[PDB]
């Protein structure tokens, strides 16, 4: 809907200005207005992660994954949150899935980021 | 990187 789209733009503006709590609020509205749109979940996760609200961020990334399995960013985001909460083994699994999807849908464009997350997860484990 | 990006 147009109002979901306004909420996504508002979100993006708040996020851009590092106003995390207002981004959370905007993405919650995006999610209410377009509950099947994976971007709202991933986007709210991004803001919750900046707030160090990791269980919530991870739950939203999981929901984004359910709504759009080709949404590579959700996988990368989730792994990053899993590293933050020392779920290393899980992160490495999530990164394996992200690398595969990244090749399939993005033709490798996020490979560098995924490989450095993988390295970081492996070493801390 | 992803933690700096929104859609």
- Residue corresponding to tokens 């991933």: A42
Q: Measure CB to CB from residue B6 to each of A46, A76, A113 and give the nearest one.
A: A46
| Minimal CA separation from A21 to chain B, in Å | 15
Residues in chain B: 7
Last residue before each gap in chain B (C to N over 2.5 A): none
**Method used for this model?**
X-ray
**What's the CATH architecture for A1-125?**
Alpha Horseshoe (1.25)
DSSP alpha helices (H): ranges in chain A?
2-16, 20-33, 38-50, 54-67, 72-84, 88-106, 111-124
Provide the residue ranges of all domains of chain A, joining segments of one domain with +.
1-125
Q: Which of residues 59-98 of A touch B (CB under 8 A)?
A: 73, 76-77, 80
Backbone angles phi, psi at A61, to 5 degrees: -60, -45
Residues 6+ apart with CB under 8 A from B3: A46, A49, A50, A77, A80
- Integer CA distances (angstroms), A117 to A13, A107, B3, B5, in order: 27, 18, 12, 16
Nearest to B2 among A11, A47, A73 (CB): A73
């Amino acid at each position: 809907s147009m109002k979901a789209e306004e909420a996504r733009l508002e979100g993006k503006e708040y996020f851009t200005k590092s106003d995390w709590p207002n981004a959370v609020k905007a993405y919650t509205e995006m999610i209410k207005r377009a509950p099947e749109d994976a971007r709202g979940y991933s986007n709210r996760a991004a803001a919750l992660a900046k707030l160090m609200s990791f269980p919530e961020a991870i739950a939203d990334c999981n929901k984004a994954i359910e709504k759009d399995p080709n949404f590579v960013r959700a996988y990368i985001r989730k792994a990053t949150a899993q590293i933050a909460v020392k779920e290393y083994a899980s992160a490495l699994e999530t990164l394996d899935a992200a690398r595969t999807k990244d090749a399939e849908v993005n033709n490798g464009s996020s490979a560098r980021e995924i490989d450095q997350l993988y390295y970081k997860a492996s070493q801390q484990r | 990187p992803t933690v700096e990006e929104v859609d």
